[PDB]
Amino acid sequence: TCPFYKKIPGTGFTVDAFQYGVVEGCTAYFLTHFHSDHYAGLSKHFTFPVYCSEITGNLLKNKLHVQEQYIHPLPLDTECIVNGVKVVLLDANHCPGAVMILFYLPNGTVILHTGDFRADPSMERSLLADQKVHMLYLDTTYCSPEYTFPSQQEVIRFAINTAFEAVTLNPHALVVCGTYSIGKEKVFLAIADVLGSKVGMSQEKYKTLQCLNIPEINSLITTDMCSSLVHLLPMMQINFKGLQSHLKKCGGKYNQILAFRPTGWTHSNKFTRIADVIPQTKGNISIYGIPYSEHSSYLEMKRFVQWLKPQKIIPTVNVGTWKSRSTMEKYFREWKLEAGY
Ligand code: NI
Protein backbone atom coordinates (compact mmCIF):
# COMPACT_ATOMS: atom_id res chain seq x y z
CA THR A 1 0.00 0.00 0.00
CA CYS A 2 1.23 3.41 -1.16
CA PRO A 3 2.27 5.76 1.69
CA PHE A 4 0.76 9.26 2.13
CA TYR A 5 3.99 11.21 1.38
CA LYS A 6 3.91 9.73 -2.20
CA LYS A 7 0.45 11.04 -2.97
CA ILE A 8 -0.39 14.51 -4.31
CA PRO A 9 -3.77 15.62 -2.74
CA GLY A 10 -6.35 17.04 -5.10
CA THR A 11 -4.99 15.18 -8.07
CA GLY A 12 -4.88 11.80 -9.72
CA PHE A 13 -1.10 11.80 -9.20
CA THR A 14 1.60 9.79 -7.39
CA VAL A 15 5.39 10.29 -7.26
CA ASP A 16 7.95 7.48 -7.28
CA ALA A 17 5.18 4.93 -6.43
CA PHE A 18 5.66 1.89 -8.70
CA GLN A 19 6.09 -0.96 -6.06
CA TYR A 20 2.52 -0.88 -4.67
CA GLY A 21 0.61 -2.42 -7.65
CA VAL A 22 -2.32 -0.48 -9.13
CA VAL A 23 -2.74 2.58 -6.84
CA GLU A 24 -6.47 3.39 -6.37
CA GLY A 25 -7.32 6.70 -8.06
CA CYS A 26 -3.98 7.18 -9.85
CA THR A 27 -4.31 8.44 -13.46
CA ALA A 28 -0.61 9.44 -13.93
CA TYR A 29 2.55 8.12 -12.22
CA PHE A 30 5.48 10.60 -12.03
CA LEU A 31 9.08 9.33 -11.83
CA THR A 32 11.61 11.96 -10.48
CA HIS A 33 14.80 10.03 -11.50
CA PHE A 34 16.26 6.65 -12.56
CA HIS A 35 17.46 5.39 -9.10
CA SER A 36 16.30 1.87 -8.10
CA ASP A 37 14.61 2.80 -4.71
CA HIS A 38 12.45 5.19 -6.81
CA TYR A 39 11.71 3.13 -9.96
CA ALA A 40 11.19 -0.14 -7.94
CA GLY A 41 8.35 -2.02 -9.62
CA LEU A 42 8.56 -0.68 -13.19
CA SER A 43 9.16 -3.27 -16.00
CA LYS A 44 8.09 -3.92 -19.69
CA HIS A 45 4.61 -5.04 -18.51
CA PHE A 46 3.69 -1.68 -16.90
CA THR A 47 0.57 -0.20 -18.68
CA PHE A 48 -0.15 3.23 -17.07
CA PRO A 49 1.14 6.70 -18.23
CA VAL A 50 4.58 7.57 -16.76
CA TYR A 51 5.60 11.20 -16.70
CA CYS A 52 9.33 12.10 -16.46
CA SER A 53 12.28 13.85 -18.09
CA GLU A 54 13.61 12.96 -21.63
CA ILE A 55 16.70 11.31 -20.05
CA THR A 56 14.65 9.23 -17.57
CA GLY A 57 12.40 8.19 -20.45
CA ASN A 58 15.51 7.02 -22.50
CA LEU A 59 16.50 4.82 -19.56
CA LEU A 60 12.93 3.39 -19.03
CA LYS A 61 12.73 2.39 -22.75
CA ASN A 62 16.33 0.97 -23.14
CA LYS A 63 17.14 -0.40 -19.70
CA LEU A 64 13.78 -1.52 -18.24
CA HIS A 65 11.97 -2.02 -21.69
CA VAL A 66 8.92 -0.05 -20.74
CA GLN A 67 6.92 0.33 -23.98
CA GLU A 68 7.05 3.64 -25.72
CA GLN A 69 3.29 4.30 -25.73
CA TYR A 70 3.32 4.60 -21.87
CA ILE A 71 6.39 6.96 -21.69
CA HIS A 72 5.56 10.68 -21.50
CA PRO A 73 8.74 12.82 -21.54
CA LEU A 74 8.34 16.57 -20.66
CA PRO A 75 10.80 19.36 -21.37
CA LEU A 76 12.24 21.26 -18.37
CA ASP A 77 11.37 24.83 -17.34
CA THR A 78 8.11 24.73 -19.30
CA GLU A 79 4.47 24.93 -18.19
CA CYS A 80 2.67 21.68 -19.29
CA ILE A 81 -0.92 20.46 -18.70
CA VAL A 82 -1.24 16.85 -17.47
CA ASN A 83 -4.77 15.45 -17.02
CA GLY A 84 -6.10 18.95 -16.44
CA VAL A 85 -3.42 20.18 -14.00
CA LYS A 86 -0.52 22.59 -14.75
CA VAL A 87 2.96 21.12 -13.91
CA VAL A 88 6.57 22.22 -14.36
CA LEU A 89 9.77 20.04 -14.23
CA LEU A 90 12.92 21.64 -12.84
CA ASP A 91 16.50 20.40 -12.72
CA ALA A 92 17.18 18.77 -9.32
CA ASN A 93 21.03 18.98 -9.39
CA HIS A 94 21.07 15.22 -8.49
CA CYS A 95 21.94 12.56 -11.27
CA PRO A 96 21.33 12.90 -15.07
CA GLY A 97 17.63 13.36 -15.87
CA ALA A 98 16.62 14.08 -12.17
CA VAL A 99 13.81 16.56 -11.66
CA MET A 100 11.75 18.46 -9.02
CA ILE A 101 8.03 18.76 -9.90
CA LEU A 102 5.86 21.93 -9.32
CA PHE A 103 2.12 21.14 -9.20
CA TYR A 104 -0.45 23.97 -9.54
CA LEU A 105 -3.61 22.53 -7.89
CA PRO A 106 -7.03 23.37 -9.23
CA ASN A 107 -7.92 24.98 -5.83
CA GLY A 108 -4.89 27.43 -5.96
CA THR A 109 -2.48 25.48 -3.73
CA VAL A 110 1.08 25.18 -5.11
CA ILE A 111 3.14 22.01 -4.21
CA LEU A 112 6.94 21.49 -4.84
CA HIS A 113 8.19 17.83 -4.74
CA THR A 114 12.01 17.96 -4.72
CA GLY A 115 12.56 14.27 -5.55
CA ASP A 116 16.23 13.70 -4.72
CA PHE A 117 18.14 17.04 -4.97
CA ARG A 118 21.31 18.94 -4.07
CA ALA A 119 20.03 22.44 -3.18
CA ASP A 120 21.87 25.28 -4.91
CA PRO A 121 21.53 29.14 -4.84
CA SER A 122 20.89 28.97 -8.64
CA MET A 123 17.47 27.46 -7.81
CA GLU A 124 16.49 30.86 -6.29
CA ARG A 125 16.39 32.13 -9.96
CA SER A 126 14.48 29.35 -11.58
CA LEU A 127 10.66 29.50 -12.12
CA LEU A 128 10.39 29.08 -8.28
CA ALA A 129 11.10 32.85 -7.89
CA ASP A 130 7.64 33.80 -9.31
CA GLN A 131 5.18 32.41 -6.73
CA LYS A 132 4.36 31.14 -3.37
CA VAL A 133 4.64 27.39 -2.43
CA HIS A 134 2.26 26.08 0.20
CA MET A 135 3.59 22.48 0.62
CA LEU A 136 7.21 21.17 0.19
CA TYR A 137 7.88 17.39 -0.18
CA LEU A 138 11.54 17.53 0.89
CA ASP A 139 14.63 15.27 0.33
CA THR A 140 15.84 15.19 3.95
CA THR A 141 18.68 12.61 3.41
CA TYR A 142 21.23 14.74 5.32
CA CYS A 143 18.97 16.83 7.58
CA SER A 144 21.31 17.13 10.62
CA PRO A 145 24.13 19.56 11.22
CA GLU A 146 26.80 16.88 11.44
CA TYR A 147 26.43 16.29 7.69
CA THR A 148 29.06 18.47 6.13
CA PHE A 149 31.04 17.79 2.88
CA PRO A 150 32.87 19.98 0.28
CA SER A 151 31.57 21.38 -2.98
CA GLN A 152 31.57 19.00 -5.99
CA GLN A 153 34.20 21.36 -7.66
CA GLU A 154 36.67 20.92 -4.70
CA VAL A 155 36.22 17.14 -4.75
CA ILE A 156 36.87 16.95 -8.55
CA ARG A 157 39.95 19.20 -8.15
CA PHE A 158 41.31 16.72 -5.52
CA ALA A 159 40.61 13.71 -7.77
CA ILE A 160 42.15 15.23 -11.00
CA ASN A 161 45.32 16.37 -9.14
CA THR A 162 45.70 12.96 -7.39
CA ALA A 163 45.30 10.91 -10.59
CA PHE A 164 47.52 13.21 -12.69
CA GLU A 165 50.31 13.11 -10.09
CA ALA A 166 50.24 9.30 -9.75
CA VAL A 167 50.21 8.44 -13.45
CA THR A 168 52.90 11.06 -14.29
CA LEU A 169 55.13 9.45 -11.64
CA ASN A 170 54.27 5.97 -12.98
CA PRO A 171 53.00 5.69 -16.62
CA HIS A 172 52.24 2.04 -15.87
CA ALA A 173 49.58 2.85 -13.19
CA LEU A 174 45.87 2.14 -13.99
CA VAL A 175 43.08 4.25 -12.56
CA VAL A 176 39.85 2.49 -11.55
CA CYS A 177 36.57 4.16 -10.49
CA GLY A 178 33.59 2.37 -8.85
CA THR A 179 29.95 2.83 -9.95
CA TYR A 180 26.56 1.12 -9.09
CA SER A 181 23.97 3.52 -10.46
CA ILE A 182 23.80 6.64 -12.62
CA GLY A 183 25.14 9.84 -11.09
CA LYS A 184 28.61 11.13 -10.26
CA GLU A 185 29.87 10.68 -13.91
CA LYS A 186 32.03 13.90 -13.45
CA VAL A 187 34.45 11.82 -11.25
CA PHE A 188 35.57 9.42 -14.03
CA LEU A 189 35.10 11.86 -16.97
CA ALA A 190 37.28 14.59 -15.28
CA ILE A 191 40.08 12.06 -14.46
CA ALA A 192 40.06 10.57 -18.03
CA ASP A 193 40.17 14.11 -19.54
CA VAL A 194 43.31 15.06 -17.54
CA LEU A 195 45.01 11.76 -18.57
CA GLY A 196 44.13 12.03 -22.32
CA SER A 197 42.21 8.79 -22.25
CA LYS A 198 38.71 7.45 -22.92
CA VAL A 199 36.93 5.66 -20.12
CA GLY A 200 36.65 1.88 -20.54
CA MET A 201 33.71 -0.11 -19.22
CA SER A 202 31.31 -3.08 -19.70
CA GLN A 203 28.77 -3.16 -22.49
CA GLU A 204 25.95 -2.82 -19.89
CA LYS A 205 27.41 0.40 -18.42
CA TYR A 206 28.20 1.83 -21.90
CA LYS A 207 24.52 1.27 -22.81
CA THR A 208 23.37 3.21 -19.72
CA LEU A 209 25.72 6.13 -20.43
CA GLN A 210 24.48 6.31 -24.08
CA CYS A 211 20.98 7.24 -22.71
CA LEU A 212 22.18 10.33 -20.83
CA ASN A 213 22.44 13.11 -23.51
CA ILE A 214 25.98 14.00 -22.47
CA PRO A 215 27.64 16.24 -25.17
CA GLU A 216 30.29 14.57 -27.29
CA ILE A 217 29.97 11.27 -25.25
CA ASN A 218 31.25 9.10 -28.18
CA SER A 219 34.56 11.01 -27.74
CA LEU A 220 34.76 10.21 -23.99
CA ILE A 221 33.87 6.50 -23.41
CA THR A 222 34.52 3.04 -24.90
CA THR A 223 34.01 -0.71 -24.47
CA ASP A 224 37.61 -1.43 -25.57
CA MET A 225 39.26 -1.84 -22.20
CA CYS A 226 42.74 -2.35 -23.74
CA SER A 227 42.80 1.10 -25.30
CA SER A 228 41.83 2.93 -22.01
CA LEU A 229 43.80 3.77 -18.83
CA VAL A 230 40.74 4.68 -16.77
CA HIS A 231 38.44 1.66 -16.12
CA LEU A 232 34.99 1.55 -14.46
CA LEU A 233 34.08 -1.38 -12.30
CA PRO A 234 31.12 -2.27 -10.14
CA MET A 235 31.37 -0.62 -6.66
CA MET A 236 31.48 -4.06 -5.02
CA GLN A 237 34.75 -4.86 -6.74
CA ILE A 238 36.49 -1.73 -5.24
CA ASN A 239 38.48 -3.62 -2.57
CA PHE A 240 41.98 -5.17 -2.42
CA LYS A 241 40.86 -8.65 -3.66
CA GLY A 242 38.71 -7.36 -6.51
CA LEU A 243 41.36 -4.98 -7.70
CA GLN A 244 44.14 -7.63 -7.54
CA SER A 245 41.98 -9.84 -9.73
CA HIS A 246 41.33 -7.03 -12.19
CA LEU A 247 45.11 -6.20 -12.50
CA LYS A 248 45.78 -9.89 -13.39
CA LYS A 249 43.36 -9.56 -16.32
CA CYS A 250 45.25 -6.63 -17.84
CA GLY A 251 48.05 -8.86 -19.29
CA GLY A 252 51.09 -7.17 -17.66
CA LYS A 253 50.22 -3.76 -19.10
CA TYR A 254 50.05 -2.21 -15.59
CA ASN A 255 51.92 -2.69 -12.33
CA GLN A 256 49.92 -0.37 -9.92
CA ILE A 257 46.19 0.59 -9.36
CA LEU A 258 44.90 3.88 -7.98
CA ALA A 259 41.11 3.44 -7.27
CA PHE A 260 38.34 5.83 -6.29
CA ARG A 261 35.06 5.07 -4.36
CA PRO A 262 32.74 8.03 -4.53
CA THR A 263 30.58 7.68 -1.43
CA GLY A 264 28.16 10.14 0.10
CA TRP A 265 29.02 11.41 3.61
CA THR A 266 31.17 9.19 5.88
CA HIS A 267 32.15 10.05 9.58
CA SER A 268 35.73 10.75 8.41
CA ASN A 269 34.03 14.09 7.21
CA LYS A 270 33.66 15.21 10.89
CA PHE A 271 37.50 15.48 11.30
CA THR A 272 39.30 15.60 7.92
CA ARG A 273 39.50 18.30 5.20
CA ILE A 274 39.37 17.14 1.54
CA ALA A 275 42.97 18.32 1.05
CA ASP A 276 44.08 15.99 3.90
CA VAL A 277 42.35 12.79 2.62
CA ILE A 278 44.61 9.74 2.39
CA PRO A 279 44.05 6.31 0.82
CA GLN A 280 44.00 2.78 2.19
CA THR A 281 46.99 0.96 0.66
CA LYS A 282 48.09 -2.68 0.28
CA GLY A 283 51.22 -3.23 -1.82
CA ASN A 284 50.79 -1.73 -5.32
CA ILE A 285 47.01 -0.91 -4.75
CA SER A 286 45.66 2.34 -3.19
CA ILE A 287 41.90 3.16 -2.64
CA TYR A 288 40.56 6.67 -2.00
CA GLY A 289 37.05 7.26 -0.56
CA ILE A 290 35.99 10.68 -1.85
CA PRO A 291 32.88 12.55 -0.47
CA TYR A 292 31.17 13.38 -3.76
CA SER A 293 27.51 14.12 -2.79
CA GLU A 294 24.44 14.45 -5.06
CA HIS A 295 22.25 15.39 -2.03
CA SER A 296 22.03 18.71 -0.10
CA SER A 297 24.34 19.26 2.85
CA TYR A 298 22.52 20.44 6.03
CA LEU A 299 23.49 24.08 5.39
CA GLU A 300 22.44 23.96 1.62
CA MET A 301 19.06 22.43 2.65
CA LYS A 302 18.48 25.06 5.39
CA ARG A 303 19.29 27.95 3.01
CA PHE A 304 16.87 26.65 0.32
CA VAL A 305 14.00 26.15 2.76
CA GLN A 306 14.53 29.53 4.55
CA TRP A 307 14.43 31.14 1.02
CA LEU A 308 11.33 29.27 -0.18
CA LYS A 309 9.34 29.82 3.09
CA PRO A 310 6.87 26.94 2.66
CA GLN A 311 3.76 26.73 4.83
CA LYS A 312 4.17 23.00 5.47
CA ILE A 313 7.09 20.52 5.03
CA ILE A 314 6.64 16.77 4.33
CA PRO A 315 9.95 14.85 4.55
CA THR A 316 10.47 12.01 2.04
CA VAL A 317 13.69 10.47 3.56
CA ASN A 318 14.42 9.14 7.04
CA VAL A 319 10.68 8.75 7.75
CA GLY A 320 10.73 5.29 9.36
CA THR A 321 11.83 6.14 12.95
CA TRP A 322 10.22 8.37 15.58
CA LYS A 323 13.68 9.71 16.57
CA SER A 324 14.39 10.79 12.92
CA ARG A 325 11.00 12.36 12.51
CA SER A 326 11.31 14.31 15.83
CA THR A 327 14.80 15.53 14.94
CA MET A 328 13.69 16.81 11.52
CA GLU A 329 10.60 18.57 12.97
CA LYS A 330 12.82 20.43 15.47
CA TYR A 331 15.09 21.71 12.73
CA PHE A 332 12.16 22.86 10.60
CA ARG A 333 10.84 24.91 13.62
CA GLU A 334 14.23 26.45 14.32
CA TRP A 335 14.57 27.49 10.64
CA LYS A 336 11.12 29.08 10.63
CA LEU A 337 11.71 31.03 13.94
CA GLU A 338 15.11 32.24 12.87
CA ALA A 339 13.86 33.48 9.43
CA GLY A 340 10.39 34.78 10.55
CA TYR A 341 7.90 32.98 8.27
NI1 NI B 1 18.54 9.29 -5.97
GROMACS .gro file of N, CA and C and ligand atoms in nm, residues 33 35 38 94 116 295, ligand 1:
model
   19
   33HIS      N    1   1.345   1.041  -1.103
   33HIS     CA    2   1.480   1.003  -1.150
   33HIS      C    3   1.496   0.855  -1.158
   35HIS      N    4   1.679   0.606  -1.022
   35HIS     CA    5   1.746   0.539  -0.910
   35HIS      C    6   1.651   0.425  -0.865
   38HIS      N    7   1.357   0.440  -0.628
   38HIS     CA    8   1.245   0.519  -0.681
   38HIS      C    9   1.171   0.458  -0.796
   94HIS      N   10   2.082   1.658  -0.908
   94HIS     CA   11   2.107   1.522  -0.849
   94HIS      C   12   2.182   1.442  -0.956
  116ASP      N   13   1.486   1.358  -0.527
  116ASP     CA   14   1.623   1.370  -0.472
  116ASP      C   15   1.687   1.497  -0.530
  295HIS      N   16   2.333   1.487  -0.290
  295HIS     CA   17   2.225   1.539  -0.203
  295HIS      C   18   2.273   1.664  -0.123
  342NI      NI   19   1.854   0.929  -0.597
   0.00000   0.00000   0.00000
